[PDB]
């Protein structure tokens, strides 16, 4: 995968790369590199998953669905993978560099935040910092979405709070205006319904 | 076509603005501060390069070859001096979409030749 | 949408006192081929010329020609702004403007800066970009019923725009006015109405909820969407 | 420049015929589905020079229930229609003893003209339409459900069945695109029939405002 | 006719629907409660299936009233379920698929 | 209006001020002097045309 | 207010920190050879965030080795140790490079609520 990314970089450097419709050359190069590295991550994860025995306890908990996922196993055994900030690779926070340990204009996988180690192998210092950046993104998202989502929740509640099913089976608000002549267009409660198949449709 | 530069009066050192002389039907450059006039030599008053076909080799300076953080290569020798080593870097300039193009500079001192593959 | 700037390579203003002997050397052929017969009022000519250079790539990418461009200029500004041009054969796609009769040169600069922004050569305003593609998912494919009675998903071209003019795009030849829609619910309300925006709003909320694989009972979406549309207008939850 | 002009005229006429048919006016099947070539044969393919002139595109239909209840469709030539043109059309309607009309403007209509269209409502119910919004029949859109103007007897039956007042039904604006398509005024109720994924079919009723 | 109504309701061929009663599970429950032998001929008259499904459909009331407006609203409220019911409790399916008594 | 104008939001002043006005207020009245202070390479017409609107606005 | 950090200066492709400096640092308590003597020897340098942009760092002296394909070959500084990127509470995590980073953040927060002996003179 790293040789593939090197080949794509060499193509871009020699102007042997032409953009695809709907994207600029930078975006096309980024798409190619990200596709290569995602393919590498998925292939390595499949290798790790097939390596597992029936006695593996990660596989036990993932199989039962109790906890974990196959991506977690891949990150613990195979490779942690690409770290993204705002949906893109690690940005050039220095001048044309992600860290002072890299050369300028280095779009390689390790420079831009591809963790080629597993959690058991251990991250290198640059992989450690990039992974901390990616995890900081999740912490910020978790801590910032709450206010907006809670305000949305309160707004929805105050907008619909008094809408109720009446004894004539119509759904009405406090003003007694009719919102639905029957709840859900069918006058049925949502606990008792369930998924089925229409046998004469297909 | 090429751009057109600003030219200043010879008396007040203010910029000369374009003007047309109907009597001779000829372009003049005249100062709206003093009463100076000059016979133009280009005949072009304004140029807009919407395509922005700028040769970024002109923006490069040889001093960048002293940067320890730039990558160096031995595979692209200098055509002007024959030095083997050379630094390379991308455009990293706005208004340039196809900016994966590499620009090379010779690391030999006092040569400073710059080129592109 | 394509403005003159999107297809233009470079503009310039010259002082050409007599078009017969132009300032530029490569534009002397077609200018005399145009001037040997009087097509316009040569007396009502200004010495300030505005030469614009196009680029073959953008001309071909839109199937555009100097004829259409010159027609659009002579329509937006009438006969007051003369425009001439060569054939689509020369190595450089060039066309020359003059003003027919603030000073003249400033007026040429102003109309240059305006034409390069507001002169709509082709397309619909407010639609920046459009992407054509084949939908691999059946939700955007064309689901028909074959003569045998089976559901068949036809793999057809669909366009996704970056702006919205649903009002205009619907009324275009070879555009489906039945399935063409938008995600801007306000335009759906303005163009199609309250029940159309009710249905579209239900679709968009369902898309937001289900994109992460989740599922919410439809009666909850229906109740929310009826709350926002039961009074004939789009009632924001605010 | 000209083929597209006649195409637009044909499309506008097609939408107008569909609209009149949906309002309940007597429209023959032949003009209801009129091919573009048939339109060119009947009106021409050179509107720019004057064949067809928009004054030749004028439609006059009669209601199925009442032959005396007719309706006009005028196609003014000027892009921005002025009050004088409205007065001319109202004069013609007075002469021919017609009380309903549609004015398919091209660019728009002046404020004085709109105020004239609003003030004299009890005499002549004449509506305003942009040619841009008649190039498509919005009722054929997939998002638009089936709208049906109920009669006063039907509305009374509805309010008596569900035992409610008109202000308790959901609403539809008088300026709604579909309300304007069906030419319905305040006080009228429109029955909307739409498919429901939980019930199969759902009928709701919206009062015009 | 129900098939065409479904085809206009679900213009995409998605038969997954959310409905009150899981009729296949109830049929399975009946098969196991009464020890239905799928290999033997059944003693269920297909006319009994038709009549029973019609009476059942009459007994499932979401909108109450004999007036035509209530009749149409009742038709609409249980349309999809009644289609599912008629296509599941069909006489042929009840004869060669479920083989209920 | 025609091009891009350069302004300067000085402290204790609630209105934008053209840069050329500020340069003249500091004793540099000739346009040559101001562009000597702003543009250090006179072989570059791009910088020149981008500063020209500010001069045209302050004459 | 300029936050900076110390780094080992690098010669052509070698550290200036020779073995003699380590020798004098080992007997730090006898010959009073301290950190300041290391800085004064021109072997260590404080580099701020803005000067790091112009610096080419080696993560370890192993990066200064001549390789089959040289990455840089023109380094200017070296890390004293990469683990010094961590702070006080993250420097207590063992094997923090084998954890998901949110876990390291949660521990760095939870080492501060951990009981111990907050200070020796707690009796007074
Ligand atoms: Zn002067
Ligand atoms: Zn050289």
Curated annotation (Swiss-Prot), chain A:
Organism whose genome encodes this protein: Cricetulus griseus
Entry remark concerning the domains of this protein: The C-terminal domain (CTD) serves as a platform for assembly of factors that regulate transcription initiation, elongation, termination and mRNA processing.
Role summary: Catalytic core component of RNA polymerase II (Pol II), a DNA-dependent RNA polymerase which synthesizes mRNA precursors and many functional non-coding RNAs using the four ribonucleoside triphosphates as substrates. Pol II-mediated transcription cycle proceeds through transcription initiation, transcription elongation and transcription termination stages. RNA-dependent RNA polymerase that catalyzes the extension of a non-coding RNA (ncRNA) at the 3'-end using the four ribonucleoside triphosphates as substrates. An internal ncRNA sequence near the 3'-end serves as a template in a single-round Pol II-mediated RNA polymerization reaction. May decrease the stability of ncRNAs that repress Pol II-mediated gene transcription.
Complex formation: Component of the RNA polymerase II (Pol II) core complex consisting of 12 subunits: a ten-subunit catalytic core composed of POLR2A/RPB1, POLR2B/RPB2, POLR2C/RPB3, POLR2I/RPB9, POLR2J/RPB11, POLR2E/RPABC1, POLR2F/RPABC2, POLR2H/RPABC3, POLR2K/RPABC4 and POLR2L/RPABC5 and a mobile stalk composed of two subunits POLR2D/RPB4 and POLR2G/RPB7, protruding from the core and functioning primarily in transcription initiation. Part of Pol II(G) complex, in which Pol II core associates with an additional subunit POLR2M; unlike conventional Pol II, Pol II(G) functions as a transcriptional repressor.
Protein's name according to its UniProt entry: DNA-directed RNA polymerase II subunit RPB1
Compartments where found: Nucleus; Cytoplasm; Chromosome
Record-stated family: Belongs to the RNA polymerase beta' chain family.
Region (Bridging helix), start-end ranges: 124-165
From Swiss-Prot, chain B:
Subcellular location field: Nucleus, Nucleolus
Top-level lineage group: Eukaryota
PROSITE patterns: RNA_POL_M_15KD, ZF_TFIIS_1, ZF_TFIIS_2
MF-aspect GO terms: DNA-directed RNA polymerase activity; nucleic acid binding; zinc ion binding
Chain positions of all zinc fingers (TFIIS-type): 74-116
Record keywords, A-Z: Acetylation, DNA-directed RNA polymerase, Metal-binding, Nucleus, Transcription, Zinc, Zinc-finger
Zinc finger map (C4-type): 9-34
SMART domains in the record: RPOL9, ZnF_C2C2
Stretches assigned to coiled coil: none
Binding locations of Zn(2+) 1: 9, 12, 31, 34
A cellular-component GO term for this protein: nucleus
Positions of Zn(2+) 2 binding: 78, 81, 106, 111
One Pfam family here: Zn_ribbon_RPB9
InterPro entries found in the cross-reference section: DNA-dir_RNA_pol-M_15_CS, Rpa12/Rpb9/Rpc10/TFS, Zn_ribbon_RPB9, Zn_ribbon_RPB9_C, Znf_TFIIS
Quaternary structure note: Component of the RNA polymerase II (Pol II) complex consisting of 12 subunits.
Family (UniProt): Belongs to the archaeal RpoM/eukaryotic RPA12/RPB9/RPC11 RNA polymerase family.
Protein purpose: DNA-dependent RNA polymerase catalyzes the transcription of DNA into RNA using the four ribonucleoside triphosphates as substrates. Component of RNA polymerase II which synthesizes mRNA precursors and many functional non-coding RNAs. Pol II is the central component of the basal RNA polymerase II transcription machinery. It is composed of mobile elements that move relative to each other. RPB9 is part of the upper jaw surrounding the central large cleft and thought to grab the incoming DNA template.
Official protein name in the record: DNA-directed RNA polymerase II subunit RPB9
The organism of origin for this protein: Sus scrofa (Pig)
Curated annotation (Swiss-Prot), chain E:
Post-translational modification: The tandem heptapeptide repeats in the C-terminal domain (CTD) can be highly phosphorylated. The phosphorylation activates Pol II. Phosphorylation occurs mainly at residues 'Ser-2' and 'Ser-5' of the heptapeptide repeat and is mediated, at least, by CDK7 and CDK9. POLR2A associated with DNA is specifically phosphorylated at 'Ser-5' of the CTD by CDK7, promoting transcription initiation by triggering dissociation from DNA. Phosphorylated at 'Ser-2', Ser-5' and 'Ser-7' of the CTD by CDK9 (P-TEFb complex), promoting transcription elongation. Among tandem heptapeptide repeats of the C-terminal domain (CTD) some do not match the Y-S-P-T-S-P-S consensus, the seventh serine residue 'Ser-7' being replaced by a lysine. 'Lys-7' in these non-consensus heptapeptide repeats can be alternatively acetylated, methylated and dimethylated. EP300 is one of the enzyme able to acetylate 'Lys-7'. Acetylation at 'Lys-7' of non-consensus heptapeptide repeats is associated with 'Ser-2' phosphorylation and active transcription. Regulates initiation or early elongation steps of transcription specially for inducible genes.
Subcellular locations according to the entry: Nucleus; Cytoplasm; Chromosome
Main function: Catalytic core component of RNA polymerase II (Pol II), a DNA-dependent RNA polymerase which synthesizes mRNA precursors and many functional non-coding RNAs using the four ribonucleoside triphosphates as substrates. Pol II-mediated transcription cycle proceeds through transcription initiation, transcription elongation and transcription termination stages.
Protein family (similarity comment): Belongs to the RNA polymerase beta' chain family.
Protein name per UniProt: DNA-directed RNA polymerase II subunit RPB1
Organism of provenance: Cricetulus griseus
Taxonomy of the source species: Eukaryota, Metazoa, Chordata, Craniata, Vertebrata
């Amino acid at each position: 995968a790293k040789q593939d990314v090197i080949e794509v970089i060499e193509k871009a450097h020699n102007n042997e790369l032409e953009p695809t419709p709907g994207n600029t050359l930078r975006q096309t190069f980024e798409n190619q590199v990200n596709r290569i590295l995602n393919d590498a991550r998925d292939k390595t994860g499949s290798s790790a998953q097939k390596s597992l025995s029936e006695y593996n306890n990660f596989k036990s908990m993932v199989v039962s669905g109790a906890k974990g996922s196959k991506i977690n196993i891949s990150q613990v055994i195979a490779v942690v993978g690409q770290q993204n900030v705002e949906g893109k690779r690690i940005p050039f926070g220095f001048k044309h560099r992600t860290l002072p340990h890299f050369i300028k204009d280095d779009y390689g996988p390790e420079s831009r935040g591809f963790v080629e180690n597993s959690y058991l192998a251990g991250l290198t210092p640059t992989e450690f910092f990039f992974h901390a950046m990616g995890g900081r993104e999740g912490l910020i998202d978790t801590a910032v979405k709450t206010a907006e989502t809670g305000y949305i929740q309160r707004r929805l509640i105050k907008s619909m709070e008094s809408v109720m099913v009446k004894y004539d089976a119509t759904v009405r608000n406090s003003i007694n205006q009719v919102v639905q002549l029957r709840y859900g267009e069918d006058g049925l409660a949502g606990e008792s319904v369930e998924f089925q198949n229409l046998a004469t449709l297909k | 076509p090429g751009f057109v530069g600003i030219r200043f009066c010879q008396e007040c050192n203010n910029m000369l603005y374009p003007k047309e002389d109907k009597e001779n039907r000829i372009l003049l450059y005249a100062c709206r501060n003093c009463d100076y006039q000059q016979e133009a030599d280009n005949s072009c008053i304004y140029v807009n390069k919407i395509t922005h076909e700028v040769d970024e080799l002109t923006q490069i300076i040889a001093d960048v070859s002293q940067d320890p953080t730039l990558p160096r290569t031995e595979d692209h020798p200098c055509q002007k001096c024959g030095h083997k080593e050379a630094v390379f870097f991308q455009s990293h300039s706005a208004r340039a979409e196809d900016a994966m193009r590499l620009y090379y500079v010779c690391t030999a001192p006092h040569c400073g030749h710059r080129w592109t593959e | 949408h394509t403005t003159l700037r999107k297809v233009t390579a470079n503009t310039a203003i010259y002082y050409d006192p007599n078009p017969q002997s132009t300032v530029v050397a490569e534009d002397q052929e077609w200018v005399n081929v145009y001037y040997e017969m009087p097509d316009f009022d040569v007396a009502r000519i200004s010495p300030w010329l505005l030469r614009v250079e196009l680029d073959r790539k953008h001309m071909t990418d839109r199937k555009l020609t100097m004829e259409q461009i010159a027609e659009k200029i002579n329509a937006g500004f009438g006969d007051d702004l003369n425009c001439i041009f060569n054939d689509d054969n020369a190595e450089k796609l060039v066309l020359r403007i003059r003003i027919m009769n603030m000073d003249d040169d400033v007026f040429l600069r102003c109309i240059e800066s305006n034409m390069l922004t507001d002169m709509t050569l082709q397309g619909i305003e407010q639609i920046s970009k459009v992407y054509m593609h084949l939908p691999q998912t059946d939700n955007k494919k064309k689901i028909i019923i074959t003569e045998d009675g089976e559901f068949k998903a036809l793999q057809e071209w669909i366009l996704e725009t970056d702006g919205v003019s649903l009002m205009r795009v619907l009324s275009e030849k070879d555009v489906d006015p039945v399935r063409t829609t938008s995600n801007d619910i306000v335009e759906i309300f303005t163009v199609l109405g309250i029940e159309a925006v009710r249905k579209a709003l239900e679709r968009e909320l369902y898309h937001v909820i289900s994109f992460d694989g989740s599922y919410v009972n439809y009666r909850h979406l229906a109740l929310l969407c009826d709350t926002m549309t039961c009074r004939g207008h789009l009632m924001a939850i605010t | 420049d000209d083929e597209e002009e006649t195409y637009r005229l044909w499309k506008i006429r097609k939408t107008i015929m569909q609209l009149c048919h949906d309002r309940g006016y007597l429209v023959t099947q032949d003009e209801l589905d009129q091919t573009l070539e048939e339109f060119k044969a009947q009106f021409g393919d050179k509107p720019s020079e004057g064949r067809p002139r928009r004054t030749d595109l004028t439609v006059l239909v009669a209601h199925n229930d009442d032959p005396t209840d007719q309706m006009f469709v005028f196609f003014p030539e000027e892009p921005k229609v002025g009050i004088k043109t409205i007065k001319v059309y109202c004069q013609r309607m007075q002469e021919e003893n017609i009380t309903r009309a549609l004015i398919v403007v091209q660019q728009g209509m002046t404020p004085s003209a709109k105020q004239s269209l609003v003030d004299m409502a009890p005499k002549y119910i004449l509506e305003q339409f942009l040619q841009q919004e008649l190039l498509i029949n919005i009722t054929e859109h997939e998002l638009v459900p089936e709208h049906v103007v109920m009669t006063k007897e039907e509305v009374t039956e509805l309010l008596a069945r569900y035992k409610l007042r008109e202000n308790q039904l959901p609403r539809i604006q008088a300026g709604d695109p579909v309300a304007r398509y069906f030419g319905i005024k305040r006080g009228q109720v429109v029955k909307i029939i739409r498919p429901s994924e939980t019930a199969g079919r759902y009928i709701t009723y919206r009062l015009v405002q | 006719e129900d098939r065409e109504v479904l085809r206009v309701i679900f213009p995409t061929g998605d038969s997954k629907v959310v409905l009150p009663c899981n009729l296949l599970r109830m049929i399975w429950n009946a098969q196991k409660i009464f020890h239905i032998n799928p290999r033997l001929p059944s003693d269920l008259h297909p006319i009994k299936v038709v009549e029973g499904v019609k009476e059942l459909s009459k007994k499932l009331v979401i909108v109450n009233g004999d007036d035509p407006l209530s009749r149409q609203a009742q038709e609409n409220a249980t349309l999809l379920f009644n289609i599912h019911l008629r296509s599941t409790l069909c006489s042929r399916r009840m004869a060669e698929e479920f083989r209920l008594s | 209006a025609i091009g891009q104008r350069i302004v300067a939001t000085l402290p204790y002043i609630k209105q934008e001020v053209p840069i050329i006005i500020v340069f003249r207020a500091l004793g540099f009245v000739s346009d040559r002097d101001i562009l000597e202070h702003i543009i250090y390479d006179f072989e570059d017409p791009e910088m020149m045309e981008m500063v020209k609107p500010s001069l045209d606005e302050a004459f | 207010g300029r936050i900076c950090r110390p780094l080992l200066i690098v010669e052509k492709q070698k550290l200036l920190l020779k073995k003699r400096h380590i020798d004098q640092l080992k007997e730090r308590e006898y010959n009073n050879y301290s950190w300041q003597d290391l800085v004064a020897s021109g072997v260590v340098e404080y580099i701020d965030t803005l000067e790091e942009e112009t610096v080419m760092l080696a993560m370890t002296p192993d990066d200064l080795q001549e390789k089959e394909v040289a990455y840089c070959s023109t380094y200017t500084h070296c890390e004293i140790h990469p683990s010094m990127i961590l702070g006080v509470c993250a420097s207590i995590i063992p094997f923090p490079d084998h954890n998901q980073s949110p876990r390291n953040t949660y521990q760095s927060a939870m080492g501060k609520q951990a009981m111990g002996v907050y200070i020796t003179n707690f009796h007074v």
